[PDB]
Amino acid sequence: SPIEMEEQRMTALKEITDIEYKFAQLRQKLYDN
Amino acid sequence: IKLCKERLYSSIEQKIKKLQEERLLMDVANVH
């Protein structure tokens, strides 16, 4: 179904995007330390 | 001893500047 696939792919994008967010602040705090 | 210490320190500050350019590219990477 197109609705199922749409919500799935956007969920995965939000997933890896918040991964990017927290790994970026990982870089930030490691830089600080 | 002065020359030797400050030579190795010049190398280690080129290390710190390595990390300067590191956070330059991650500066544009956070600007992303």
Side-chain angles (χ1 to χ4, degrees), chain A:
Chain A
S1 147
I3 321 305
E4 170 130 31
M5 181 245 180
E6 169 129 359
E7 185 233 9
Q8 165 40 239
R9 314 311 284 119
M10 296 260 165
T11 298
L13 263 303
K14 302 270 222 43
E15 205 292 310
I16 194 151
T17 304
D18 208 296
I19 300 204
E20 184 78 353
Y21 192 59
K22 198 44 217 55
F23 276 72
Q25 271 234 340
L26 156 57
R27 315 165 91 94
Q28 304 321 291
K29 181 240 201 153
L30 248 172
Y31 180 56
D32 253 357
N33 196 7

PDB file of all heavy atoms in Angstrom, chain A:
ATOM      1  N   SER A   1       0.827  -1.202   0.000  1.00  0.00           N
ATOM      2  CA  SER A   1       0.000   0.000   0.000  1.00  0.00           C
ATOM      3  C   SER A   1       0.865   1.257   0.000  1.00  0.00           C
ATOM      4  O   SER A   1       1.899   1.306   0.667  1.00  0.00           O
ATOM      5  CB  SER A   1      -0.941   0.004   1.206  1.00  0.00           C
ATOM      6  OG  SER A   1      -1.172   1.323   1.666  1.00  0.00           O
ATOM      7  N   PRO A   2       0.441   2.278  -0.754  1.00  0.00           N
ATOM      8  CA  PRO A   2       1.243   3.512  -0.817  1.00  0.00           C
ATOM      9  C   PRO A   2       1.270   4.286   0.490  1.00  0.00           C
ATOM     10  O   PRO A   2       2.288   4.908   0.811  1.00  0.00           O
ATOM     11  CB  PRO A   2       0.565   4.308  -1.941  1.00  0.00           C
ATOM     12  CG  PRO A   2      -0.833   3.794  -1.978  1.00  0.00           C
ATOM     13  CD  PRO A   2      -0.754   2.340  -1.611  1.00  0.00           C
ATOM     14  N   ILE A   3       0.177   4.265   1.259  1.00  0.00           N
ATOM     15  CA  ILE A   3       0.148   4.982   2.533  1.00  0.00           C
ATOM     16  C   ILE A   3       1.083   4.316   3.534  1.00  0.00           C
ATOM     17  O   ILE A   3       1.858   4.987   4.235  1.00  0.00           O
ATOM     18  CB  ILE A   3      -1.295   5.053   3.072  1.00  0.00           C
ATOM     19  CG1 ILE A   3      -2.299   5.304   1.940  1.00  0.00           C
ATOM     20  CG2 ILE A   3      -1.418   6.131   4.137  1.00  0.00           C
ATOM     21  CD1 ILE A   3      -2.016   6.539   1.106  1.00  0.00           C
ATOM     22  N   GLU A   4       1.012   2.984   3.622  1.00  0.00           N
ATOM     23  CA  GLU A   4       1.916   2.226   4.479  1.00  0.00           C
ATOM     24  C   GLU A   4       3.370   2.529   4.146  1.00  0.00           C
ATOM     25  O   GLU A   4       4.168   2.844   5.039  1.00  0.00           O
ATOM     26  CB  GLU A   4       1.634   0.730   4.325  1.00  0.00           C
ATOM     27  CG  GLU A   4       2.650  -0.192   4.985  1.00  0.00           C
ATOM     28  CD  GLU A   4       1.999  -1.244   5.862  1.00  0.00           C
ATOM     29  OE1 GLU A   4       0.863  -1.662   5.548  1.00  0.00           O
ATOM     30  OE2 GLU A   4       2.624  -1.662   6.858  1.00  0.00           O
ATOM     31  N   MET A   5       3.726   2.450   2.862  1.00  0.00           N
ATOM     32  CA  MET A   5       5.105   2.691   2.449  1.00  0.00           C
ATOM     33  C   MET A   5       5.527   4.128   2.724  1.00  0.00           C
ATOM     34  O   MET A   5       6.655   4.376   3.156  1.00  0.00           O
ATOM     35  CB  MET A   5       5.274   2.354   0.968  1.00  0.00           C
ATOM     36  CG  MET A   5       6.686   2.552   0.441  1.00  0.00           C
ATOM     37  SD  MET A   5       6.781   3.855  -0.801  1.00  0.00           S
ATOM     38  CE  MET A   5       8.529   3.821  -1.185  1.00  0.00           C
ATOM     39  N   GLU A   6       4.640   5.091   2.465  1.00  0.00           N
ATOM     40  CA  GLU A   6       4.967   6.491   2.716  1.00  0.00           C
ATOM     41  C   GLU A   6       5.298   6.722   4.185  1.00  0.00           C
ATOM     42  O   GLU A   6       6.350   7.293   4.517  1.00  0.00           O
ATOM     43  CB  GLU A   6       3.798   7.378   2.283  1.00  0.00           C
ATOM     44  CG  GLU A   6       3.895   8.830   2.719  1.00  0.00           C
ATOM     45  CD  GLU A   6       3.675   9.794   1.570  1.00  0.00           C
ATOM     46  OE1 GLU A   6       3.458   9.324   0.433  1.00  0.00           O
ATOM     47  OE2 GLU A   6       3.716  11.020   1.802  1.00  0.00           O
ATOM     48  N   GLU A   7       4.410   6.275   5.079  1.00  0.00           N
ATOM     49  CA  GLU A   7       4.655   6.456   6.504  1.00  0.00           C
ATOM     50  C   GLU A   7       5.905   5.702   6.943  1.00  0.00           C
ATOM     51  O   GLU A   7       6.682   6.204   7.762  1.00  0.00           O
ATOM     52  CB  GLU A   7       3.432   6.011   7.306  1.00  0.00           C
ATOM     53  CG  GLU A   7       3.530   6.266   8.800  1.00  0.00           C
ATOM     54  CD  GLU A   7       3.258   5.026   9.622  1.00  0.00           C
ATOM     55  OE1 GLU A   7       3.162   3.931   9.030  1.00  0.00           O
ATOM     56  OE2 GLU A   7       3.139   5.145  10.859  1.00  0.00           O
ATOM     57  N   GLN A   8       6.144   4.520   6.366  1.00  0.00           N
ATOM     58  CA  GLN A   8       7.336   3.748   6.706  1.00  0.00           C
ATOM     59  C   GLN A   8       8.611   4.500   6.340  1.00  0.00           C
ATOM     60  O   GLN A   8       9.515   4.650   7.172  1.00  0.00           O
ATOM     61  CB  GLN A   8       7.280   2.392   5.994  1.00  0.00           C
ATOM     62  CG  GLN A   8       8.583   1.589   5.926  1.00  0.00           C
ATOM     63  CD  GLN A   8       9.408   1.645   7.197  1.00  0.00           C
ATOM     64  OE1 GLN A   8      10.563   2.072   7.182  1.00  0.00           O
ATOM     65  NE2 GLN A   8       8.818   1.212   8.305  1.00  0.00           N
ATOM     66  N   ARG A   9       8.709   4.974   5.096  1.00  0.00           N
ATOM     67  CA  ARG A   9       9.947   5.608   4.656  1.00  0.00           C
ATOM     68  C   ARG A   9      10.178   6.922   5.386  1.00  0.00           C
ATOM     69  O   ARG A   9      11.317   7.244   5.745  1.00  0.00           O
ATOM     70  CB  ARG A   9       9.945   5.830   3.143  1.00  0.00           C
ATOM     71  CG  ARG A   9       9.488   4.638   2.319  1.00  0.00           C
ATOM     72  CD  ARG A   9      10.193   3.346   2.719  1.00  0.00           C
ATOM     73  NE  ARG A   9      11.560   3.275   2.211  1.00  0.00           N
ATOM     74  CZ  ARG A   9      12.637   3.190   2.985  1.00  0.00           C
ATOM     75  NH1 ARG A   9      12.504   3.164   4.303  1.00  0.00           N
ATOM     76  NH2 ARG A   9      13.845   3.131   2.443  1.00  0.00           N
ATOM     77  N   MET A  10       9.115   7.693   5.634  1.00  0.00           N
ATOM     78  CA  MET A  10       9.313   8.928   6.384  1.00  0.00           C
ATOM     79  C   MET A  10       9.675   8.643   7.838  1.00  0.00           C
ATOM     80  O   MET A  10      10.454   9.388   8.446  1.00  0.00           O
ATOM     81  CB  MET A  10       8.082   9.825   6.273  1.00  0.00           C
ATOM     82  CG  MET A  10       7.832  10.282   4.845  1.00  0.00           C
ATOM     83  SD  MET A  10       8.413  11.963   4.543  1.00  0.00           S
ATOM     84  CE  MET A  10       8.404  12.006   2.752  1.00  0.00           C
ATOM     85  N   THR A  11       9.142   7.558   8.407  1.00  0.00           N
ATOM     86  CA  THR A  11       9.567   7.140   9.738  1.00  0.00           C
ATOM     87  C   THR A  11      11.054   6.810   9.761  1.00  0.00           C
ATOM     88  O   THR A  11      11.774   7.220  10.678  1.00  0.00           O
ATOM     89  CB  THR A  11       8.740   5.936  10.194  1.00  0.00           C
ATOM     90  OG1 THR A  11       7.359   6.308  10.287  1.00  0.00           O
ATOM     91  CG2 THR A  11       9.221   5.432  11.547  1.00  0.00           C
ATOM     92  N   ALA A  12      11.532   6.066   8.759  1.00  0.00           N
ATOM     93  CA  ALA A  12      12.952   5.719   8.709  1.00  0.00           C
ATOM     94  C   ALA A  12      13.821   6.958   8.515  1.00  0.00           C
ATOM     95  O   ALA A  12      14.932   7.046   9.058  1.00  0.00           O
ATOM     96  CB  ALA A  12      13.210   4.708   7.594  1.00  0.00           C
ATOM     97  N   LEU A  13      13.336   7.925   7.733  1.00  0.00           N
ATOM     98  CA  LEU A  13      14.082   9.165   7.559  1.00  0.00           C
ATOM     99  C   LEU A  13      14.188   9.935   8.869  1.00  0.00           C
ATOM    100  O   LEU A  13      15.281  10.379   9.241  1.00  0.00           O
ATOM    101  CB  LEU A  13      13.441  10.024   6.469  1.00  0.00           C
ATOM    102  CG  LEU A  13      14.061   9.905   5.073  1.00  0.00           C
ATOM    103  CD1 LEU A  13      15.543  10.253   5.116  1.00  0.00           C
ATOM    104  CD2 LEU A  13      13.859   8.522   4.465  1.00  0.00           C
ATOM    105  N   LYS A  14      13.067  10.107   9.581  1.00  0.00           N
ATOM    106  CA  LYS A  14      13.117  10.727  10.905  1.00  0.00           C
ATOM    107  C   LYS A  14      14.040   9.955  11.842  1.00  0.00           C
ATOM    108  O   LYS A  14      14.767  10.552  12.649  1.00  0.00           O
ATOM    109  CB  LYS A  14      11.711  10.818  11.498  1.00  0.00           C
ATOM    110  CG  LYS A  14      10.713  11.601  10.662  1.00  0.00           C
ATOM    111  CD  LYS A  14      10.711  13.072  11.041  1.00  0.00           C
ATOM    112  CE  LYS A  14       9.293  13.618  11.095  1.00  0.00           C
ATOM    113  NZ  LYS A  14       8.350  12.683  11.772  1.00  0.00           N
ATOM    114  N   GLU A  15      14.024   8.622  11.740  1.00  0.00           N
ATOM    115  CA  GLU A  15      14.908   7.768  12.531  1.00  0.00           C
ATOM    116  C   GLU A  15      16.368   8.142  12.326  1.00  0.00           C
ATOM    117  O   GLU A  15      17.056   8.550  13.272  1.00  0.00           O
ATOM    118  CB  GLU A  15      14.650   6.306  12.144  1.00  0.00           C
ATOM    119  CG  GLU A  15      14.989   5.236  13.173  1.00  0.00           C
ATOM    120  CD  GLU A  15      16.477   5.115  13.427  1.00  0.00           C
ATOM    121  OE1 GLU A  15      17.231   5.017  12.435  1.00  0.00           O
ATOM    122  OE2 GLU A  15      16.886   5.109  14.604  1.00  0.00           O
ATOM    123  N   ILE A  16      16.854   8.028  11.091  1.00  0.00           N
ATOM    124  CA  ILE A  16      18.274   8.260  10.841  1.00  0.00           C
ATOM    125  C   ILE A  16      18.607   9.738  11.012  1.00  0.00           C
ATOM    126  O   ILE A  16      19.757  10.103  11.286  1.00  0.00           O
ATOM    127  CB  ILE A  16      18.668   7.724   9.451  1.00  0.00           C
ATOM    128  CG1 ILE A  16      20.193   7.644   9.330  1.00  0.00           C
ATOM    129  CG2 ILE A  16      18.081   8.591   8.350  1.00  0.00           C
ATOM    130  CD1 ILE A  16      20.677   6.552   8.399  1.00  0.00           C
ATOM    131  N   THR A  17      17.597  10.610  10.937  1.00  0.00           N
ATOM    132  CA  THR A  17      17.851  12.035  11.112  1.00  0.00           C
ATOM    133  C   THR A  17      18.076  12.379  12.578  1.00  0.00           C
ATOM    134  O   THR A  17      18.971  13.167  12.910  1.00  0.00           O
ATOM    135  CB  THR A  17      16.687  12.841  10.542  1.00  0.00           C
ATOM    136  OG1 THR A  17      16.487  12.483   9.167  1.00  0.00           O
ATOM    137  CG2 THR A  17      16.988  14.329  10.634  1.00  0.00           C
ATOM    138  N   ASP A  18      17.285  11.795  13.479  1.00  0.00           N
ATOM    139  CA  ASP A  18      17.548  12.018  14.895  1.00  0.00           C
ATOM    140  C   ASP A  18      18.808  11.277  15.336  1.00  0.00           C
ATOM    141  O   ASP A  18      19.496  11.708  16.275  1.00  0.00           O
ATOM    142  CB  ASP A  18      16.338  11.605  15.733  1.00  0.00           C
ATOM    143  CG  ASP A  18      16.242  12.383  17.035  1.00  0.00           C
ATOM    144  OD1 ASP A  18      17.153  12.250  17.876  1.00  0.00           O
ATOM    145  OD2 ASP A  18      15.262  13.136  17.211  1.00  0.00           O
ATOM    146  N   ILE A  19      19.149  10.179  14.652  1.00  0.00           N
ATOM    147  CA  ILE A  19      20.477   9.593  14.838  1.00  0.00           C
ATOM    148  C   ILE A  19      21.559  10.612  14.489  1.00  0.00           C
ATOM    149  O   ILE A  19      22.524  10.795  15.241  1.00  0.00           O
ATOM    150  CB  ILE A  19      20.626   8.301  14.009  1.00  0.00           C
ATOM    151  CG1 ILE A  19      19.592   7.259  14.436  1.00  0.00           C
ATOM    152  CG2 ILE A  19      22.041   7.755  14.117  1.00  0.00           C
ATOM    153  CD1 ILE A  19      19.994   5.827  14.126  1.00  0.00           C
ATOM    154  N   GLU A  20      21.425  11.272  13.334  1.00  0.00           N
ATOM    155  CA  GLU A  20      22.352  12.338  12.961  1.00  0.00           C
ATOM    156  C   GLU A  20      22.420  13.415  14.033  1.00  0.00           C
ATOM    157  O   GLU A  20      23.505  13.885  14.383  1.00  0.00           O
ATOM    158  CB  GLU A  20      21.933  12.949  11.622  1.00  0.00           C
ATOM    159  CG  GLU A  20      22.879  14.016  11.081  1.00  0.00           C
ATOM    160  CD  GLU A  20      24.129  13.441  10.443  1.00  0.00           C
ATOM    161  OE1 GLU A  20      24.338  12.213  10.526  1.00  0.00           O
ATOM    162  OE2 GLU A  20      24.900  14.221   9.844  1.00  0.00           O
ATOM    163  N   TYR A  21      21.264  13.816  14.562  1.00  0.00           N
ATOM    164  CA  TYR A  21      21.216  14.824  15.620  1.00  0.00           C
ATOM    165  C   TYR A  21      22.054  14.415  16.828  1.00  0.00           C
ATOM    166  O   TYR A  21      22.946  15.162  17.269  1.00  0.00           O
ATOM    167  CB  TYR A  21      19.763  15.057  16.036  1.00  0.00           C
ATOM    168  CG  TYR A  21      19.551  16.265  16.919  1.00  0.00           C
ATOM    169  CD1 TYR A  21      19.915  17.536  16.494  1.00  0.00           C
ATOM    170  CD2 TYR A  21      18.979  16.134  18.176  1.00  0.00           C
ATOM    171  CE1 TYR A  21      19.719  18.644  17.302  1.00  0.00           C
ATOM    172  CE2 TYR A  21      18.781  17.233  18.991  1.00  0.00           C
ATOM    173  CZ  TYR A  21      19.153  18.486  18.550  1.00  0.00           C
ATOM    174  OH  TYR A  21      18.956  19.584  19.359  1.00  0.00           O
ATOM    175  N   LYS A  22      21.780  13.232  17.382  1.00  0.00           N
ATOM    176  CA  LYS A  22      22.445  12.856  18.624  1.00  0.00           C
ATOM    177  C   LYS A  22      23.916  12.537  18.393  1.00  0.00           C
ATOM    178  O   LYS A  22      24.753  12.798  19.264  1.00  0.00           O
ATOM    179  CB  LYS A  22      21.740  11.675  19.291  1.00  0.00           C
ATOM    180  CG  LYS A  22      22.121  11.547  20.758  1.00  0.00           C
ATOM    181  CD  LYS A  22      22.102  12.913  21.439  1.00  0.00           C
ATOM    182  CE  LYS A  22      23.225  13.047  22.452  1.00  0.00           C
ATOM    183  NZ  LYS A  22      24.559  12.764  21.847  1.00  0.00           N
ATOM    184  N   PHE A  23      24.264  12.002  17.220  1.00  0.00           N
ATOM    185  CA  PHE A  23      25.674  11.771  16.923  1.00  0.00           C
ATOM    186  C   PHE A  23      26.412  13.086  16.699  1.00  0.00           C
ATOM    187  O   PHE A  23      27.599  13.208  17.029  1.00  0.00           O
ATOM    188  CB  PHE A  23      25.815  10.852  15.710  1.00  0.00           C
ATOM    189  CG  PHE A  23      25.724   9.389  16.045  1.00  0.00           C
ATOM    190  CD1 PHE A  23      24.515   8.819  16.405  1.00  0.00           C
ATOM    191  CD2 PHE A  23      26.852   8.587  16.009  1.00  0.00           C
ATOM    192  CE1 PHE A  23      24.431   7.473  16.717  1.00  0.00           C
ATOM    193  CE2 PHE A  23      26.775   7.242  16.321  1.00  0.00           C
ATOM    194  CZ  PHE A  23      25.563   6.684  16.674  1.00  0.00           C
ATOM    195  N   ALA A  24      25.719  14.098  16.175  1.00  0.00           N
ATOM    196  CA  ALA A  24      26.331  15.415  16.049  1.00  0.00           C
ATOM    197  C   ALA A  24      26.632  16.007  17.418  1.00  0.00           C
ATOM    198  O   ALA A  24      27.716  16.561  17.639  1.00  0.00           O
ATOM    199  CB  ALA A  24      25.422  16.345  15.249  1.00  0.00           C
ATOM    200  N   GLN A  25      25.687  15.905  18.356  1.00  0.00           N
ATOM    201  CA  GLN A  25      25.984  16.402  19.700  1.00  0.00           C
ATOM    202  C   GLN A  25      26.997  15.513  20.420  1.00  0.00           C
ATOM    203  O   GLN A  25      27.697  15.972  21.333  1.00  0.00           O
ATOM    204  CB  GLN A  25      24.709  16.574  20.523  1.00  0.00           C
ATOM    205  CG  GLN A  25      24.092  17.956  20.346  1.00  0.00           C
ATOM    206  CD  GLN A  25      23.871  18.677  21.663  1.00  0.00           C
ATOM    207  OE1 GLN A  25      23.816  18.056  22.723  1.00  0.00           O
ATOM    208  NE2 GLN A  25      23.761  20.002  21.600  1.00  0.00           N
ATOM    209  N   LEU A  26      27.093  14.239  20.025  1.00  0.00           N
ATOM    210  CA  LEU A  26      28.219  13.409  20.455  1.00  0.00           C
ATOM    211  C   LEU A  26      29.541  14.041  20.043  1.00  0.00           C
ATOM    212  O   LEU A  26      30.463  14.173  20.861  1.00  0.00           O
ATOM    213  CB  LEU A  26      28.090  12.004  19.862  1.00  0.00           C
ATOM    214  CG  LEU A  26      29.329  11.111  19.682  1.00  0.00           C
ATOM    215  CD1 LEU A  26      30.097  10.877  20.983  1.00  0.00           C
ATOM    216  CD2 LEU A  26      28.934   9.789  19.034  1.00  0.00           C
ATOM    217  N   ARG A  27      29.656  14.410  18.761  1.00  0.00           N
ATOM    218  CA  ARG A  27      30.840  15.127  18.294  1.00  0.00           C
ATOM    219  C   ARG A  27      31.063  16.397  19.103  1.00  0.00           C
ATOM    220  O   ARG A  27      32.197  16.708  19.483  1.00  0.00           O
ATOM    221  CB  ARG A  27      30.709  15.461  16.807  1.00  0.00           C
ATOM    222  CG  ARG A  27      30.215  14.322  15.934  1.00  0.00           C
ATOM    223  CD  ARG A  27      29.768  14.829  14.573  1.00  0.00           C
ATOM    224  NE  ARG A  27      30.844  14.805  13.589  1.00  0.00           N
ATOM    225  CZ  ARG A  27      31.051  13.800  12.747  1.00  0.00           C
ATOM    226  NH1 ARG A  27      30.252  12.742  12.775  1.00  0.00           N
ATOM    227  NH2 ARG A  27      32.048  13.855  11.878  1.00  0.00           N
ATOM    228  N   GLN A  28      29.985  17.132  19.387  1.00  0.00           N
ATOM    229  CA  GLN A  28      30.097  18.370  20.161  1.00  0.00           C
ATOM    230  C   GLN A  28      30.712  18.121  21.534  1.00  0.00           C
ATOM    231  O   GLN A  28      31.668  18.803  21.931  1.00  0.00           O
ATOM    232  CB  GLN A  28      28.723  19.023  20.321  1.00  0.00           C
ATOM    233  CG  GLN A  28      27.977  19.315  19.032  1.00  0.00           C
ATOM    234  CD  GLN A  28      28.876  19.803  17.922  1.00  0.00           C
ATOM    235  OE1 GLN A  28      29.410  20.909  17.986  1.00  0.00           O
ATOM    236  NE2 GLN A  28      29.044  18.986  16.890  1.00  0.00           N
ATOM    237  N   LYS A  29      30.177  17.150  22.277  1.00  0.00           N
ATOM    238  CA  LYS A  29      30.616  16.974  23.657  1.00  0.00           C
ATOM    239  C   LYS A  29      31.998  16.334  23.713  1.00  0.00           C
ATOM    240  O   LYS A  29      32.803  16.653  24.599  1.00  0.00           O
ATOM    241  CB  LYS A  29      29.596  16.150  24.445  1.00  0.00           C
ATOM    242  CG  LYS A  29      29.971  15.954  25.908  1.00  0.00           C
ATOM    243  CD  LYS A  29      30.118  14.490  26.278  1.00  0.00           C
ATOM    244  CE  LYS A  29      29.984  14.309  27.782  1.00  0.00           C
ATOM    245  NZ  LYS A  29      29.489  12.960  28.162  1.00  0.00           N
ATOM    246  N   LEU A  30      32.307  15.447  22.760  1.00  0.00           N
ATOM    247  CA  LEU A  30      33.662  14.911  22.684  1.00  0.00           C
ATOM    248  C   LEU A  30      34.664  16.014  22.369  1.00  0.00           C
ATOM    249  O   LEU A  30      35.746  16.066  22.967  1.00  0.00           O
ATOM    250  CB  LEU A  30      33.735  13.798  21.640  1.00  0.00           C
ATOM    251  CG  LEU A  30      33.989  12.390  22.185  1.00  0.00           C
ATOM    252  CD1 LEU A  30      33.837  11.344  21.093  1.00  0.00           C
ATOM    253  CD2 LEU A  30      35.367  12.303  22.821  1.00  0.00           C
ATOM    254  N   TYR A  31      34.318  16.900  21.427  1.00  0.00           N
ATOM    255  CA  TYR A  31      35.126  18.084  21.152  1.00  0.00           C
ATOM    256  C   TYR A  31      35.383  18.881  22.420  1.00  0.00           C
ATOM    257  O   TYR A  31      36.531  19.227  22.724  1.00  0.00           O
ATOM    258  CB  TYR A  31      34.409  18.953  20.120  1.00  0.00           C
ATOM    259  CG  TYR A  31      35.118  20.231  19.723  1.00  0.00           C
ATOM    260  CD1 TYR A  31      36.410  20.213  19.225  1.00  0.00           C
ATOM    261  CD2 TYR A  31      34.485  21.461  19.852  1.00  0.00           C
ATOM    262  CE1 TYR A  31      37.045  21.384  18.854  1.00  0.00           C
ATOM    263  CE2 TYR A  31      35.110  22.632  19.486  1.00  0.00           C
ATOM    264  CZ  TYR A  31      36.391  22.590  18.989  1.00  0.00           C
ATOM    265  OH  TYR A  31      37.021  23.760  18.629  1.00  0.00           O
ATOM    266  N   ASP A  32      34.319  19.191  23.162  1.00  0.00           N
ATOM    267  CA  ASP A  32      34.469  19.946  24.402  1.00  0.00           C
ATOM    268  C   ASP A  32      35.440  19.258  25.353  1.00  0.00           C
ATOM    269  O   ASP A  32      36.375  19.888  25.862  1.00  0.00           O
ATOM    270  CB  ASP A  32      33.106  20.132  25.071  1.00  0.00           C
ATOM    271  CG  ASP A  32      32.585  21.549  24.945  1.00  0.00           C
ATOM    272  OD1 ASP A  32      33.305  22.400  24.382  1.00  0.00           O
ATOM    273  OD2 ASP A  32      31.456  21.811  25.412  1.00  0.00           O
ATOM    274  N   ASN A  33      35.243  17.957  25.588  1.00  0.00           N
ATOM    275  CA  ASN A  33      36.050  17.256  26.583  1.00  0.00           C
ATOM    276  C   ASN A  33      37.518  17.191  26.175  1.00  0.00           C
ATOM    277  O   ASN A  33      38.410  17.420  27.004  1.00  0.00           O
ATOM    278  CB  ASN A  33      35.495  15.850  26.812  1.00  0.00           C
ATOM    279  CG  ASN A  33      36.017  15.216  28.089  1.00  0.00           C
ATOM    280  OD1 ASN A  33      36.698  15.864  28.885  1.00  0.00           O
ATOM    281  ND2 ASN A  33      35.696  13.944  28.292  1.00  0.00           N
TER     282      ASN A  33
END
